[PDB]
Amino acid sequence: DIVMTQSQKFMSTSVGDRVSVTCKASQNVGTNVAWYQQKPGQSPKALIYSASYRYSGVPDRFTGSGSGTDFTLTISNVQSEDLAEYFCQQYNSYPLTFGAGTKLELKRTVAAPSVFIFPPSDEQLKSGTASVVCLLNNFYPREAKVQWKVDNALQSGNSQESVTEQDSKDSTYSLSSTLTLSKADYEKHKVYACEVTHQGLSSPVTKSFNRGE
Amino acid sequence: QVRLQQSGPELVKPGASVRISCKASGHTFTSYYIYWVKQRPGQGLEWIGWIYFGNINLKYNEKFKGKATLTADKSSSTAYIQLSSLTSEDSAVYFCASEDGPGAYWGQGTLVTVSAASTKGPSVFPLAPSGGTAALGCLVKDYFPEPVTVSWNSGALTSGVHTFPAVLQSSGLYSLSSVVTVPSSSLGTQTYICNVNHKPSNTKVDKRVEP
Numbered sequence: 040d041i042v043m044t045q046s047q048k049f050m051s052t053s054v055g056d057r058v059s060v061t062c063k064a065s066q067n068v069g070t071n072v073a074w075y076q077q078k079p080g081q082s083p084k085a086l087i088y089s090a091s092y093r094y095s096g097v098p099d100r101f102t103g104s105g106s107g108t109d110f111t112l113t114i115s116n117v118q119s120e121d122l123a124e125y126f127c128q129q130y131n132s133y134p135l136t137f138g139a140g141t142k143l144e145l146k147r148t149v150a151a152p153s154v155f156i157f158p159p160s161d162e163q164l165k166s167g168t169a170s171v172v173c174l175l176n177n178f179y180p181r182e183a184k185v186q187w188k189v190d191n192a193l194q195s196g197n198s199q200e201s202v203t204e205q206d207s208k209d210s211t212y213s214l215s216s217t218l219t220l221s222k223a224d225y226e227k228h229k230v231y232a233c234e235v236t237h238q239g240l241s242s243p244v245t246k247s248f249n250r251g252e
Numbered sequence: 253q254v255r256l257q258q259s260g261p262e263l264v265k266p267g268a269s270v271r272i273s274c275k276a277s278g279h280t281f282t283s284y285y286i287y288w289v290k291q292r293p294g295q296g297l298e299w300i301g302w303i304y305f306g307n308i309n310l311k312y313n314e315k316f317k318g319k320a321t322l323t324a325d326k327s328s329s330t331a332y333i334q335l336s337s338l339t340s341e342d343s344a345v346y347f348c349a350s351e352d353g354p355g356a357y358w359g360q361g362t363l364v365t366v367s368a369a370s371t372k373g374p375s376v377f378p379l380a381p382s383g384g385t386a387a388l389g390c391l392v393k394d395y396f397p398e399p400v401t402v403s404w405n406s407g408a409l410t411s412g413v414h415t416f417p418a419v420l421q422s423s424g425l426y427s428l429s430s431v432v433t434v435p436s437s438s439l440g441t442q443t444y445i446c447n448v449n450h451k452p453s454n455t456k457v458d459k460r461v462e463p
């Protein structure tokens with residue numbers, strides 16, 4: 040199987056800007072490469088065939104190029120209706136393979152996350168399992184890093200992040216980080232902190248609580 | 253010129269089978285292809301195969317042989333895909349796609365949901381608000397399968413609500429949080445209910461959240 044690598048999973052643009060979505064094939068596919076657009080809920084719409092030829096109904100701001108192994112879909116003068124996910128695909132050999140997709144998202148001013156931390160509920164403490172939740176609210180850009188430090192000790196493996204899709208009103212993201220412990224280990228530790236680094240934060244911010252208010 | 257229209261959404265059980273249809277309208281001639289494509293939720297596209305309406309030629313994606321059977325009726329200009337021995341790995345949206353002259357067309361998609369043999373409703377735990385805006389929410393833990401559906405104050409609270417995409421825990425069970433930001437002055441005067449619906453287990457859980 041030929042692998043269509045789209046190294047950019049997210050890209051930011053303003054209306055009017057020019058953006059280039061890249062795609063690299065693991066083997067030579069000539070110019071037999073297509074591009075597709077998909078908005079949430081909608082079906083995918085075919086944009087380009089033969090690397091540089093537009094399908095019917097596709098505006099001229101969508102230019103495809105590339106050959107052999109490297110391919111690029113360039114959108115000039117981006118309009119609001121161009122914010123979507125974009126997939127490349129090869130059809131030079133079987134099996135036909137799509138790329139992983141690139142989401143084209145709206146550029147905006149940097150916004151630091153409002154950070155909140157939630158202790159586990161006494162209800163859940165009866166479950167023998169304890170979940171500590173840290174919320175990063177309405178920030179930009181998407182890149183953020185959360186660390187969990189229990190009695191100042193870096194955590195690993197025992198945590199899971201989740202990130203919202205970009206907001207259609209204020210163009211921010213939000214992120215939740217959940218630390219799952221046994222109630223056993225939760226009770227034999229005291230300080231619970233989530234450490235937030237972000238481009239809008241002038242220095243890393245740790246939000247924390249001591250078990251027992 | 254060409255309009256692809258597919259069959260309705262399928263809700264089936266493991267080990268069973270479904271047959272999806274894709275009627276192509278707008279063709280006078282049979283010299284066209286129907287391609288079938290799979291998309292699991294929040295994932296990319298995967299090509300299943302194609303069928304040519306001129307002579308009913310076929311190509312399958314090799315990893316779909318035995319899973320997918322492609323057939324075509326010229327008379328009603330309708331393509332069909334049958335999916336057999338259904339598993340959880342088969343739950344997806346299935347699109348059909350076609351070309352005509354310089355144009356390219358896709359169907360509206362057919363969602364196939366393969367139900368779980370074992371279902372779990374969500375445990376809903378309060379995320380209690382311990383500068384002048386507070387955050388509160390509901391941790392929606394250990395449910396299976398997808399999807400969950402969360403509301404606040406029976407639809408009356410929407411601004412500031414973030415319901416996070418589910419994350420599949422190490423236990424094979426889904427967990428998510430739904431949060432809201434509200435003015436901290438309201439914590440002593442406004443009641444906050446998260447309304448959680450999980451239809452696989454007919455679970456409707458309305459959870460009170462207080463400081």
Ligand SMILES: CCC(=O)N(c1ccccc1)C1CCN(CCc2ccccc2)CC1
Pocket residue numbers: 073085088089130135287299349350351352353354355356357358
């Ligand atoms: C997996 C789907 C797929 O690969 N394709 C497709 C796309 C949309 C809808 C149906 C199928 C195309 C197959 C062949 N085209 C090039 C032949 C061509 C080009 C321009 C007009 C008419 C024909 C490129 C991709």
